[PDB]
Design an enzyme around this catalytic site. Structure first.
Site, PDB file in Angstrom:
ATOM      1  N   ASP B 244      -9.745   7.571   4.250  1.00  0.00           N
ATOM      2  CA  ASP B 244      -8.917   8.435   3.424  1.00  0.00           C
ATOM      3  C   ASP B 244      -9.221   8.166   1.959  1.00  0.00           C
ATOM      4  O   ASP B 244      -9.118   7.028   1.499  1.00  0.00           O
ATOM      5  CB  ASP B 244      -7.441   8.203   3.720  1.00  0.00           C
ATOM      6  N   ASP B 354      -8.661  15.462  10.504  1.00  0.00           N
ATOM      7  CA  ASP B 354      -7.384  14.888  10.097  1.00  0.00           C
ATOM      8  C   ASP B 354      -6.556  15.831   9.231  1.00  0.00           C
ATOM      9  O   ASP B 354      -5.590  15.391   8.604  1.00  0.00           O
ATOM     10  CB  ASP B 354      -7.617  13.566   9.362  1.00  0.00           C
TER      11      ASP B 354
HETATM   12 ZN    ZN Z   1      -6.806  10.927   6.950  1.00  0.00          ZN
END
Ligand code: ZN
Ligand code: ZN
Ligand code: ZN
Lengths: 47, 1082, 47, 96, 48, 48
Positions: B244, B354
């Site tokens: 991320d 995601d």
């Molecule tokens: Zn993520």
């Protein structure tokens, strides 16, 4: 590429039960016997 | 042992650790530490290090005992429960450490003999930040970490090989069905291995491995396992590490996570020749290149070797609901250009495992940007409806299709246990269409990827499949694009796959439409500002001889903007430090975009208003691709001026005449009336809109008689939010069952003048939370400049687990509502019939939500909001949330919310679209710098024709000096228009794609003074046109034209054919680092 | 009659899992403690 | 009571032992359908000791044995096991 | 698509997305079936 | 009971208990619960 850009023909996910019970009539000697495999078993039976 | 334990003997080795502590919470690089700072303090096992996010550097000096001249492998074990990154002496990153899941560093056979040293850059945070009790709880700033292992080890390699064998066999014992004979064969073999092994006899290890060979076969020790049965694989394994860009850590920590993941994966690639690793986000490659250029050179060599496959083709793994359409195109444009520049690769698979929801035009944008494959797994989190299929054709609004696969083992961080391999094929949802599953293994959600243990387990799973044959045939040496090639080959180019038309709705994380309101408002303002700046920069570069198009500055601004659209930052689900980074850089993007725009404007002959020039010479910049016949704007703190434009659309001049249809505000029996030529708004002293009467069609719009709402429209309601698990992400359907209606407001007349009538409602939300709502009606000359009843809410927001929304019951009866989404309209149900409709209790929209029947409709326009709900005559706009879990002060503070209620006397049409664009526009006050260069060239590029065709973006091409015009059909019908290019000599106009590569040549006419290229768009088509100025069944994968002449087919892959013209252009980049093209005739 | 003729307020069928797991937070002493029953257990504890 | 094992040593009063197998598909008049072939191994009661099942096919309880249709089905079961490999590997040319 | 039914119009999907839409592979209409986008449409009228 | 309870209003507790009476009956507050149907018990509880 062979993958077409445009898709104007939706395809549904096959329903399991319907397409599984469709399998029973390919060898069935019942109502749809004339349209399925048992119609071509014989080659001119003689009795 | 430390070296102080060994002084009399120079033979038994040691480990010495000197720790340097970074003073602040900064993250100095290797060259700023090693050779400059002093490693003086001594560290030892059991020591404790630093608060959260603190950095420690360890100089590790090791001496191997000479009795370890044997022991063909020597391990340095490091377990401080945090991040690692061994550095060599020359500054080369070698190996990461992540708590206990990754502790070993193999000494590279070069400094086992020589008593050498290395460095470890410890970061005092976990794989997922600190957390404070829970992972997604706000960070604990005072966490301390303990060093529990700093040992030298000389592992027993046969023992670890037997451990892997036994682990796989024991997992087969535990996971396989109770009537499966392979389960009992495995149990029998494992039992014999126990009965055979004696810890005092090391040959028992070898005979235990021989026993296990009866279950795993003989090839598990190398990559030869995958060379057996390698033609009928059902599971395709690919390594992956989802980092991320910012979720629970700053961007600065992501920078280190990237390098310590990829260096580890590169050394693993060195040890395992069949192993392949995909990583997506181009911005992460750019960050690595900035921080570690040598690692980047090594990385691009690995990319050449077809290990380390770059995928996705986007700048970041972005959310697809919130950013506007041009942002999605920019994601692909920047990502694909970076990958084509640094490597020779153009991605063909959109990688997005995601992202919280997928908008309806993503397949079209993918096809326009060269990607026909889509990989994602997030839809497995749908907690109401399981998505019907694993492999399908995803079809956009216009009909463009990508082929989508969702890895059946519902993860992108699998573990290669037998359960993961089994589930990769056996919970495939449409196995009748295809029997191939993708196994995406690694450790992710921000961190470092697969471990060598997972590759050993994969080899043993393959060996089991080869030998006893219950596990699926798993393949490791294939890329994701080869997996999709296999699917396309087996399914007749995807023709037999099921289709999904439209938006892939994520029945989860709906609160992400509203949380972090400041960032979302800033995102919309920045997107509009970037559009305006690129437009005026194009004009200035075209018409000013001494102005160069600012490609560099615009590229930087777009890089920052696209960075903040990351699928965790923009939806609003990050820790507070992430937004303490993101909001300032978004504000800086807005400020620098404004500066760029003003430079371009000054080059065009105008300047900022400066509040000293007289009103009669004030101008207004439009930047919308149509005539906004009139705009009412403030000039002083409270002075309203009406700007009109009769013919030229770019510049509006201050009006002398009064309005033909002025607005008025008066009072009645304790009711306030805002009246127009078009609307009459009756507002209760409570602040509720009692009546909304259309005066032309003499009909009431509200319907307070049916439905739950009987007391007025514009009703503010405070719902108790309290979602189930993820406070910033989620809102639950039961949140509407407990609420408080805010009906204690007081109304005062703010203004009644001809230009704008307006009342003010002072609504007490609670103690500590207050709001002031302004309801305004504007006068007009023409009905096309009307935006409806405007609402400006100033909210001091200090609630906890509350959701402020505003409701309008609207006397419309329809089974669907129209929501503007990127490049078109998504229709959502209004009826809750099935669980699919129940899941859509809150939906995402861009700038308007329309609820229309056959004869009438109501649009709600907004300038900063993305959550809407239309269900049975009740339209509800989501205004504010107050989550606490990742960020304890998420939306606390002051908020300005603008939205409009726009009633119209037909179904939804272009008037609503134009009203929403105008409502979102920033009309800038201008002054002519002179009268000799004050020409209005702002009409150089026009679109004339059906008003549902929008000239959404004007830009200069990345490569040359051509102008890029983005055009799209906004309402869903095949439409005809003409591009009119007026003050220019047009060499040619071509239709191109999202990457600005020519697709076809268009016929440009030549009128009295313009050029008038006629264009036709399909129902929801996004078209791109390249204007070059000056005087001058197989389709090609670059220009999507049927190849009638000879073609060039890439032999390295399955479905890449380029035409002769594009082959000559060298426009054949694709997921093949070393493409080989053979010629095909006829 | 009390049964209204017109229905302009659709009601969805409750999802079992969501509404069952909502039950856990009425007595939970966690994040939503301040909005649920455990907030009113005490009547001014003194220590 | 289900008998605990499919393959075991049966020991007499004196200690003399024979090796006993009970065909896991609980028939001696099986039909060579995929269910019979599957059950011949998957309802074996002590699979941890041995993973071999005997499939005794024919028509019996007084009558006439297997039909050529059953041999065709056996060949196709073996072919399925060879090709897609979920059915057990069935052998036909071996004696008891 | 819009299908004329008793006293009005029933809208049916054209896309087979879910099993609800898969079930509607043939539908009942009274006297016309209309397939329209924003700018154009085609009705099939029938008398039996 | 959740939709009814407000931590700022203590009478909501009493009406929540009244709501629960539809499932638990009215005798749960004392030992009178055990004096009903006390001739055909299937489970016998004893402290230990
Ligand atoms: Zn993520
Ligand atoms: Zn290729
Ligand atoms: Zn071409």
């Amino acid at each position: 590429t062979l993958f077409p850009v445009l898709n104007n023909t939706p395809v549904g996910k096959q329903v399991d039960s319907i397409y599984e019970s469709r399998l029973d009539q390919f060898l069935s000697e019942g109502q749809y016997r004339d349209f399925n495999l048992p119609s071509v078993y014989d080659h001119a039976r003689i009795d | 042992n430390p070296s102080g334990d060994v002084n009399n003997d120079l033979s038994k080795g040691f480990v010495d650790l000197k720790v340097y502590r970074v003073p602040d919470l900064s993250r100095p690089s290797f060259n700023e530490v090693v050779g400059h700072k002093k490693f003086d303090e001594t560290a030892s096992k059991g020591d404790t290090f630093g608060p959260s996010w603190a950095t420690f550097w360890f100089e590790v000096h090791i001496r191997l005992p000479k009795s370890w001249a044997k022991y063909e492998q020597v391990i340095f074990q490091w377990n401080c429960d945090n991040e690692g990154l061994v550095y060599s002496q020359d500054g080369v990153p070698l190996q990461a450490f992540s708590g206990s899941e990754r502790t070993d560093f193999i000494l590279p056979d070069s400094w086992k003999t020589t008593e050498d040293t290395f460095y470890i850059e410890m970061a005092c945070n976990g794989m997922f930040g600190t957390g404070a009790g829970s992972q997604i709880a706000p960070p604990d700033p005072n966490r301390y970490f303990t060093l529990t292992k700093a040992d030298l080890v000389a592992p027993n390699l046969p023992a670890m090989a037997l451990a892997y064998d036994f682990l796989l066999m024991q997992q087969c014992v535990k996971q396989l069905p109770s009537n499966c004979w392979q389960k009992y064969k495995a149990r029998q073999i494992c039992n014999d291995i126990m009965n055979t092994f004696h810890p005092n006899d090391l040959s028992t290890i070898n005979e235990c491995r021989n026993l296990a060979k009866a279950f795993l076969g003989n090839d598990i020790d190398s990559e030869a396992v995958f060379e057996k049965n390698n033609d009928k694989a059902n599971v395709f394994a690919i390594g992956h590490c989802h980092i991320d860009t910012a979720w629970l850590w700053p961007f600065a920590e992501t920078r280190r996570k990237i390098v310590r993941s990829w260096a580890t994966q590169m050394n693993i690639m060195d040890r395992y020749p069949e192993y392949q690793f995909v990583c997506s986000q181009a911005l992460q490659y750019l960050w690595l290149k900035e921080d570690h250029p040598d690692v980047f050179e090594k990385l691009k060599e690995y990319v050449n070797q077809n290990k380390f496959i770059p995928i996705g083709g986007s700048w970041v793994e972005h959310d697809t609901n919130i950013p506007n359409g041009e942002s999605l195109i920019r994601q692909f444009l920047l990502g694909q250009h970076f990958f084509e520049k640094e490597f020779g690769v153009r991605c063909r698979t959109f990688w997005l495992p995601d992202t919280f929801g997928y908008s309806s035009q993503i397949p079209q944008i993918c096809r326009l940007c060269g990607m026909d494959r889509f990989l994602t797994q997030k839809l497995s989190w749908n907690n109401i409806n399981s998505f019907p299929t694993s492999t399908f054709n995803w079809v956009a609004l216009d009909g463009s299709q990508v082929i989508c696969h969702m890895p059946p083992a519902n993860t992108y961080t699998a573990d290669t246990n037998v359960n993961d391999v089994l589930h990769s094929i056996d919970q495939h949802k449409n196995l009748v269409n295809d029997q191939a599953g993708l196994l995406v293994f690694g450790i992710g959600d921000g961190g470092g990827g697969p471990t060598p243990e997972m590759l050993e387990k994969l080899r043993r799973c393959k060996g089991i499949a080869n030998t006893v044959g219950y596990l699926p045939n798993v393949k490791l040496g294939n890329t994701v694009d080869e997996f999709f090639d296999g699917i396309l080959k087996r399914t007749n180019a995807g023709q037999t796959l099921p289709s999904w038309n439209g938006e892939l709705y994520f029945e989860f994380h709906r609160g992400t439409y509203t949380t972090q309101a400041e960032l979302k408002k800033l995102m919309r303002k920045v997107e509009i500002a970037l559009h305006d700046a690129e437009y005026v920069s194009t004009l200035a570069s075209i018409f000013s001889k001494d102005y160069s198009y600012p490609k560099e500055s615009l590229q930087d601004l777009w890089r920052d903007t696209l960075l903040c659209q990351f699928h965790d930052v923009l939806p609003g689900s990050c820790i507070e430090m992430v937004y303490k980074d993101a909001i300032p850089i978004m504000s800086k993007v807005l400020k620098n975009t404004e500066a760029l725009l003003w430079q371009a404007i000054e080059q065009l002959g105008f300047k900022k208003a400066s509040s000293s020039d007289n009103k009669e010479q004030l101008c207004l910049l439009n930047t919308l691709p149509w005539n906004v016949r009139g705009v009412i704007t403030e000039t002083e703190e409270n002075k309203l001026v009406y700007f009109e434009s009769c013919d030229g659309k770019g510049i509006l001049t201050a009006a002398h005449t009064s309005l033909k249809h002025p607005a008025a505000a008066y009072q009645k029996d304790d009711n306030f009336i805002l009246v127009n030529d078009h609307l009459r708004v009756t507002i209760a002293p409570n602040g509720l809109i009692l009546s909304l009467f259309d005066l032309h069609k003499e009909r009431e719009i509200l319907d307070l008689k049916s439905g739950k709402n009987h007391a007025g429209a514009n009703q503010y309601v405070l719902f108790e939010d309290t979602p189930l698990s993820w406070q910033a992400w989620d809102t639950e359907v039961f949140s509407l069952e407990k609420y408080e209606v805010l009906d204690k407001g007081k109304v005062s007349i703010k203004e009644s003048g001809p230009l704008r009538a307006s009342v003010v409602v002072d609504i007490p939300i609670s103690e500590l939370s207050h709001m002031k709502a302004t309801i305004s009606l504007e006068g007009y000359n023409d009905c096309s400049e009307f935006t409806g009843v405007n609402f400006t809410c100033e909210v001091d927001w200090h609630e906890s687990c509350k959701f402020l929304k505003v409701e309008f019951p609207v006397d419309i009866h329809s089974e669907f509502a129209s929501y503007e989404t990127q490049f078109g309209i998504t229709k959502r149900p209004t009826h809750y019939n099935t669980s699919w409709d129940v899941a859509k209790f809150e939906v995402c929209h861009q700038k308007f939500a329309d609820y229309s029947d056959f004869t009438y409709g109501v649009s709600v326009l907004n300038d900063c909001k993305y959550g809407f709900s239309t269900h049975g005559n009740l339209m509800r706009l989501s205004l504010l949330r107050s989550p606490k879990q990742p960020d304890a002060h998420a939306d606390m503070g002051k908020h300005t919310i603008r939205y409009a209620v726009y009633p119209h006397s037909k179904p939804l049409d272009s008037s609503t679209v134009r009203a929403a664009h105008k409502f979102n526009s920033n009309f800038r006050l201008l002054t002519r710098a002179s009268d000799t260069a004050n020409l209005d060239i702002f009409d150089a590029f026009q679109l004339v024709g059906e008003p549902n065709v929008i000239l959404s973006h004007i830009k200069m091409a990345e490569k040359g000096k051509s102008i890029i015009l983005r055009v799209y059909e906004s309402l869903g019908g095949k439409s005809r228009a003409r591009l009119v290019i007026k003050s220019l000599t047009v060499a040619s106009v071509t239709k191109c794609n999202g990457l600005e590569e020519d697709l076809e040549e268009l016929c440009t006419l030549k009128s009295n003074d313009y050029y008038e290229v006629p264009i036709e768009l399909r129902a929801f088509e996004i078209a791109t046109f390249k204007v070059n100025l000056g005087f001058k069944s197989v389709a090609c994968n670059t220009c999507l034209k049927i190849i009638r002449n000879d073609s060039f087919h890439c032999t390295k892959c399955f479905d890449f054919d380029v035409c002769r013209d594009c082959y000559a252009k060298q426009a054949f980049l694709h997921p093949c680092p070393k493409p080989h093209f053979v010629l095909v005739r006829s």
